[PDB]
């Protein structure tokens, strides 16, 4: 066992597709049970929680605190402070994070299928590459013309950091295998990347025959 | 800005809603008004003059939507295009001269352009003119891409839209008013 | 809960197998704690004895010992099967692990892809994408070349070997990204994406691209 | 259709004819190879098929016609098949090489010849050498000349055909012929 505090930025999915974009501060490693002082600072809906989750993923549970409403304060970029007070030891625990600065947008690219696949004329592969964006965090989705294809139907790698002797940037690729017909048929496909640094938070690159 | 994407875009259907109202949320850090109209929800981004001009959301204005894209949540995002209410106090047909320049020759084609309201959105003004430049002058098609829409106001001053790439969102908020427009000239420099 | 034990036997590093001389097999545990003398027993006890390691401890406690079987590289490729059994003072009942070189494989479908129609009309750095798809186990190697020159690991990005979405046979895919100078790309030279996999006839494959 | 550039690169790259090569066969990723040094280069000769049992105990000192498949991160030049007896001296003999271009509805054909250095040659050496000629003197694998079929004549005793559609099958680069048993060679380009 061993208690540690932790702060988590609001998920991009939520930041770009949810209403109640809430933030989470969480204390783990407690042997105790509760009675923990979860006091932040930006009082604009402040309403922690606990519901003691034995799911400390370890032989000794813990609890957490939420700050609903803070969907906008986050985009502005204020330094949130979640001070945690628990039994065991005195001097409480305090971790605090804010928005990330020094950001760049994704340079999306929708690559056509490999000549060789058009030959085997079976299933052509559409590759999507987003690169050069900062906040590692990014979303990627697909469309057949105007209809978003289910995630269950494509593969998206993990946003990794690229090689550069300076501006720290990340890159993400994704593969969508489509029916040979449909590609030659004519209907288009699109790659839709989401991001904080984008203007409308989403770019959409489209390619066809 | 590669031909196919410009033809694509400057071809899409544009809507002209009326008497719209909204609050404004800080989506991803930018002020945007949301509103449903024809069974389709929109998400108007205020990024230019309109950002301050409409710092209190929308309460009765008209809106020119043009699909930048549709959020994976089903919300068509459009940029600017907001013009005051009680604005249909006139029509207006302005002179539109189009000049397709090729082997170094000319090919002027004095045409005409219509303005739906009194106060205009550089967005609408630009969007339509290109739509009309494609449908009748094969723009962003084959190889006609570069150009330069020029709007000429009474007095003398004139505004310019480069055809090279979509109008900057920064200026979709901009508003002109019919009456101060003498003529419009284009130059489909098909290089 | 807490530290529930898990024994796992690992295959030799594809890398070692293809480019190395001594390839080993690792048999380790998870929940188990305590006992620093509690050893496991391997099957092909051809003299070469295992080599336990530094107890090492996962967070939240729960220690984890490993046992690497040296040079068991020939037998691997030779189709033999290994068996690792660990005994601890946790359960009077031991854990058994068994592994052998995969049968029913699939050669990587390697595709070298040209720079974005735009990335080049900025004459800065063009982006070369390599995609290996539909292959046997998920163990693959990806390498980059400038003609006859192998560029360094630091000079590129290859993502993990993920599993391809499928309804039938199970295959994986991996992607790599080499950013080159438009200048070089433009002056006509070439680039190669060499891949490593155990299903590929010659162990490797090279797919080459250029304008 | 597309691998046109690939086929070219390969069937026109620099070949190599070595001799008195000795090497204990080793195991590699489940294959039967023989590594060996020759002229600043390190080779890795893979043995697949007819040649894998013939040389169960490595290469005593035969002759090897090496063709570079690629060069792994370790500098080894992966090559396949192409070994010959050893008691291989020399038989510079010229075989008749008929090349029939079929472009259009036409057949603008021509008569040529084919040289052979060894007494015992390898289908590997034939296929390579031949196509190279078909490449240099008939622009094979260029523009649109990709498909066709090389037909060898085993002195009224058989007929060995090598499709030009793609590379020779590794399986085959282990078969050998007797330079003498050849009568004539007929190529049939199929420019579509
Ligand atoms: C964002 O935070 C809110 C609040 O912490 C979550 O919404 C709660 O959902 C439960 C569901 O039963 C309701 O009972 C509460 O009233 C909601 N809270 C409030 C005050 O809105 C919401 O789930 C979080 N969003 C996610 C899923 O990330
Ligand atoms: C067993 O194989 C592993 C995998 O190749 C070896 O671990 C590598 O050791 C080198 C240094 O010698 C490191 O650079 C790699 O990062 C290690 N890889 C791993 C496993 O993380 C290990 O040395 C081998 N041990 C024996 C007994 O041969
Ligand atoms: Ca163009």
From Swiss-Prot, chain A:
Disulfide bonds: 1-58, 25-82, 128-191
Secreted listed as a keyword: yes
Post-translational modification: N- and O-glycosylated. N-glycan at Asn-22: Hex5HexNAc4.
GO cellular component: blood microparticle; extracellular exosome; extracellular region; extracellular space; IgA immunoglobulin complex; IgG immunoglobulin complex; immunoglobulin complex, circulating; monomeric IgA immunoglobulin complex
GO biological process, one term: immune response
Keyword Glycoprotein set for record: yes
UniProt entry keywords in alphabetical sequence: Adaptive immunity, Cell membrane, Chromophore, Chromosomal rearrangement, Disulfide bond, Glycoprotein, Immunity, Immunoglobulin, Immunoglobulin domain, Membrane, Secreted, Transmembrane, Transmembrane helix
Annotated Ig-like domain residues: 3-98, 106-208
Glycosylation sites: 22
Molecular function per GO: antigen binding
Oligomeric form and interacting partners: Immunoglobulins are composed of two identical heavy chains and two identical light chains; disulfide-linked. Monomeric or polymeric. Part of the secretory IgA (sIgA) complex that consists of two, four or five IgA monomers, and two additional non-Ig polypeptides, namely the JCHAIN and the secretory component (the proteolytic product of PIGR).
Function: Constant region of immunoglobulin heavy chains. Immunoglobulins, also known as antibodies, are membrane-bound or secreted glycoproteins produced by B lymphocytes. In the recognition phase of humoral immunity, the membrane-bound immunoglobulins serve as receptors which, upon binding of a specific antigen, trigger the clonal expansion and differentiation of B lymphocytes into immunoglobulins-secreting plasma cells. Secreted immunoglobulins mediate the effector phase of humoral immunity, which results in the elimination of bound antigens.
Associated disorder: A chromosomal aberration involving IGHA1 is found in multiple myeloma (MM) cell lines. Translocation t(1;14)(q21;q32) that forms a FCRL4-IGHA1 fusion protein.
Protein name, UniProt field: Immunoglobulin heavy constant alpha 1
Source species: Homo sapiens (Human)
Complete-protein stretch covered: 123 to 331 of 398
